[PDB]
Design a protein around this ligand. Structure first.
Ligand code: MPG
Ligand code: MPG
Ligand code: MPG
Ligand code: PC
Ligand code: CL
Ligand code: CL
Ligand code: ZN
Length: 537
């Protein structure tokens, strides 16, 4: 316990950056806003069974992420960092259990390398600070893998093996309550593939199959029964609905995602392979985890980046052992390569200053470019001081390097606030809230705004195409305007209300109905049907 004062320092500096950075960006739609708002509505209603999005049934996802977010709301009230609490705790959880399994099978030093690996991995840290279900599922599934590895260690008693096995099945249950059957399909897949490569059938006896299935059913079934009974249309939807938004992604879709999301360790990607090929083989289990899940999502029709996040913890374990075998000169090689590519990021950072996308003007991206450049600069600093610390050992150099990378990608994420804040609509929320009341409708005229209703603490009344709310709009049609043509009669003859639409929608409806503009930004026009709810015009 000589240099423990460094570790305590390191982790401390990590944790404060881990949580403070949560509350420094406005919510980025659709995901962050969608789950923050669903959780808000659950929090305000108390109905933890029937998930609703803008007062409409939302049966596209299971509720565990929302349960966690709602507990967070009850403890610390509504806000940005509270809405991102589930994913941050999921990230810490993946780090923790990952280096627990690493410490069990490969020792303390390798476990430290695993924690550093997951910390520096931009996919794990970014995804850990971005409110989406993929990081929650990644943390609970990392509990599946880690608990499975803990339970298969020979030096554990039958009581410990059963404890880690029921812990594994329980984690699979939570995962099913997080994003559906994936939480059990991917493990089983990774399981059978394993038993085909190693030809160890007796492993199916160590799983505690009966007890684990029973405890998993006890965890998952109650909510599914409740929501299926209260809403008979739920099971056919959740298990049959082919969801799609506005697919067609190549089989190489997740290749730049996995490479970029594990970038500070890309140079040792071969040394990860030579980590698994070289009774129970844990590194091989992690490798079959990452590879099997990767090829599973790579051959799937629907592809989203977050799908691939659950492979990162396993990679972390592999990284932990690979870095554990490196001499000082080899890590020097890695530092040289990463210094090169980070310097290329610094030279290429002005590229984003020439961007304008998602109806966000170029200026915000000019302000993003300086933050990206700063990010690669702090990466370079961390690399330099790591090279200075290489004389004291590989582990301190890797620790400083990983800290530099983590702070770097953290700066790169916080810099996204430049383009995320004008899109969130939080700026024009106070202007709207001055005249908008909770009993007033806020029509969404063919626009599913994912962030503004959260900031208004006020749900949208969907008008016309409800997008992913279509299903909800059809099973409870008394809560929704079916088409814009009915919205015109509601608008000219109904109660005083407001409406959110796109600018092109405003110009399309302008010759039809006169509307007084309450607020505008680059992505939305907010109007009222009475002149007294807006500024002079
Ligand atoms: C022997 C030691 C047994 C330790 C058991 C740990 C139980 C953790 C279960 C958590 C399930 C999902 C967490 C998210
Ligand atoms: C005709 C009606 C078809 C309705 C499909 C319901 C599917 C239920 C899935 C149960 C999950 C077990 C795993
Ligand atoms: C965020 C969690 C990451 C935890 C990683 C702990 C690594 C500690 C590194 C200290 C270096 C000591 C050199 C001797
Ligand atoms: C996306 N969805 C929830 C509508 C269908 C997916 O369900 P499942 O793959 O968990 O069975
Ligand atoms: Cl509220
Ligand atoms: Cl701004
Ligand atoms: Zn859908």
């Amino acid at each position: 316990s000589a240099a423990t004062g460094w570790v305590v320092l390191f982790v401390a500096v990590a944790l404060v950056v881990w949580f403070v950075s949560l509350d420094m960006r406005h919510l980025v739609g659709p995901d962050e806003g969608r789950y923050a708002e669903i959780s808000r509505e659950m929090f305000a209603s108390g109905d933890w069974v029937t998930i609703r999005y803008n007062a409409l049934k939302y049966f596209e996802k299971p509720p565990f992420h929302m349960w966690v977010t709602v507990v967070g709301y009850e403890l610390f009230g509504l806000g940005e960092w509270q809405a991102r609490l589930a994913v941050a705790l999921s990230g810490l959880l993946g780090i923790g259990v990952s280096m627990m399994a690493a410490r069990r099978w490969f020792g303390a030093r390798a476990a430290a390398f695993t924690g550093l690996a997951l910390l520096a991995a931009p996919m794990w840290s970014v995804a850990a600070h971005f409110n989406t279900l993929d990081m929650t599922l990644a943390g609970v599934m990392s509990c599946v893998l880690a608990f499975m590895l803990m339970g298969q260690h020979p030096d554990a008693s039958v009581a410990a093996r059963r404890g880690w096995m029921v812990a594994c099945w329980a984690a699979m249950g939570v995962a099913i309550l997080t994003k559906g059957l994936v939480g059990i399909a991917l493990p089983g897949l990774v399981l059978v593939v394993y038993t085909l490569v190693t030809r160890d059938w007796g492993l199916w006896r160590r799983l505690h199959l009966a007890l684990g299935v029973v405890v998993m059913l006890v965890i998952t079934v109650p909510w599914f029964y409740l929501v299926s009974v209260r809403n008979p249309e739920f099971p056919n939807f959740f298990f049959i609905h082919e969801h799609w938004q506005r697919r067609s992604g190549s089989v190489f879709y997740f290749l730049p995602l996995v490479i970029g999301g594990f970038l500070p360790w890309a140079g040792i990607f071969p040394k990860l392979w030579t980590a698994m090929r070289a009774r129970f083989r844990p590194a091989l289990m992690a490798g079959i985890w990452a590879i099997a899940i990767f090829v599973f999502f790579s051959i799937s029709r629907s592809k989203l980046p977050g799908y691939i996040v659950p492979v990162i913890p396993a990679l972390g374990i592999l990284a932990g052992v690979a870095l554990d075998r490196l001499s000082p000169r080899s890590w020097g090689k890695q530092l040289i390569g990463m210094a090169i590519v980070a310097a290329c990021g610094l030279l290429a950072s002005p590229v984003v200053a020439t961007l304008n996308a998602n109806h966000i003007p170029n200026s915000f991206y000019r302000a993003y470019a300086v933050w990206v450049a700063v990010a690669f600069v702090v990466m370079l600093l961390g690399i330099a001081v790591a090279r200075l610390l290489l004389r004291r050992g590989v582990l301190p150099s890797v620790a400083v390097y990983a800290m530099g990378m983590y702070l770097g990608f953290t700066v790169a994420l916080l810099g996204h606030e430049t383009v995320g804040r004008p899109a969130s609509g939080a700026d024009i929320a106070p202007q709207i809230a001055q005249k908008l009341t909770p009993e007033m409708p806020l029509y969404g005229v063919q626009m599913l705004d994912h962030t503004l209703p959260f900031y208004l603490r006020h749900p949208l009344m969907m008008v016309g195409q409800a997008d992913e709310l279509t299903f909800g709009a059809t099973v409870e049609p008394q809560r929704v305007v079916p088409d814009v043509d009915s919205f015109t009669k509601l608008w000219k003859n109904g109660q005083p209300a407001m409406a959110v639409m796109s600018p092109d929608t405003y110009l399309a409806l302008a010759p039809t109905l006169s509307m007084y503009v309450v607020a505008r930004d680059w992505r939305r026009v907010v109007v009222a049907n009475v002149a007294s709810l807006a500024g002079p015009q």
